[PDB]
A paper describes a structure:
The second principal receptor for IgE, CD23, is a type II transmembrane glycoprotein with a C-type lectin-like domain (CTLD)4 (3, 4). In its membrane-bound form, CD23 consists of three CTLD “heads” connected to the membrane via a trimeric α-helical coiled-coil “stalk”. The interaction between CD23 and IgE is critical in the regulation of IgE synthesis, which can be up- or down-regulated depending on the oligomerization state of CD23 (2, 9, 10).
To resolve the controversy, the crystal structure of Ca2+-bound wild-type human derCD23 was solved. Unlike MBL and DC-SIGN that bind two and three Ca2+ ions, respectively, Ca2+-soaked human derCD23 crystals reveal that a single Ca2+ ion binds at the principal binding site in all four molecules of the asymmetric unit. The electron density for the Ca2+-coordinating ligands (Glu-249, Thr-251, Asp-270, and three water molecules) and the Ca2+ ion itself is well defined in three of the derCD23 molecules; electron density for the three water molecules and Thr-251 in the fourth molecule is unclear. In the wild-type Ca2+-bound derCD23 crystal structure presented here, three residues (Glu-249, Thr-251, and Asp-270) provide four oxygen atoms, and three water molecules provide a further three for the binding of Ca2+. Surprisingly, in contrast to Wurzburg et al., we found that the highly conserved Asn-269 residue is not directly involved in the binding of Ca2+; the nitrogen atom of the carboxamide group was found to form a hydrogen bond with a water molecule that acts as a Ca2+ ligand. Additionally, we found that three water molecules, not two as previously suggested, directly ligate Ca2+. In the Ca2+-bound structure, Pro-250 adopts a cis configuration in all four copies, and the distance between Thr-251 (Oγ1) and Glu-249 (Oϵ1) is 3.7 Å. In the presence of Ca2+, Pro-250 is effectively locked into the cis configuration. The structure of Ca2+-bound derCD23 reported here shows a single ion bound at the principal calcium site, liganded by Glu-249, Thr-251, Asp-270, and three water molecules; the KD is 1.5 mm.
Author numbering: 159 to 290
């Protein structure tokens, strides 16, 4: 039974989530999550997405999706590929033009963006720990 989360993190299913605040570009958020022993959030189901939207900032948040090698394939920071997606209409933009980072809007839907864009929120996740 794995639902144990650290103080300030919120459990959903087998993961823990931290809804961060404070102005950060994508890689800044990446390291903020890393320094908290987590990583920018990966999303693999509509149930997970719905949970995130419920707790997420109205003004948009960095998540852990990025065009890894700059060549057009978006990969989650945890290493996994996209199965579930929640792209906003028309996203991602059908051009390789250096908008390699993904944010989640107030609606929960995703759009690509310049990685140096400063957003006011960012979400981390980590595995919940378990009772023996
Ligand atoms: Ca776009």
């Amino acid at each position: 039974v794995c639902n144990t989360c650290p103080e300030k993190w919120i459990n959903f299913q087998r993961k823990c989530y931290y809804f961060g605040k404070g102005t950060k570009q994508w890689v800044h958020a990446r390291y903020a999550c890393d320094d908290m022993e987590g990583q920018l959030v990966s999303i693999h189901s509509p149930e997970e997405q719905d949970f995130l939207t419920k707790h997420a900032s109205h003004t948009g948040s960095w998540i852990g999706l990025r065009n890894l090698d700059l060549k057009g394939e978006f990969i989650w920071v945890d290493g996994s590929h996209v199965d579930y997606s929640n792209w906003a209409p028309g996203e991602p933009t059908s051009r390789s033009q250096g908008e390699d980072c993904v944010m989640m809007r107030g609606s929960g839907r995703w759009n690509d963006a310049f990685c140096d864009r400063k957003l006011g929120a960012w979400v981390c996740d980590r595995l919940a720990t378990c009772t023996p």
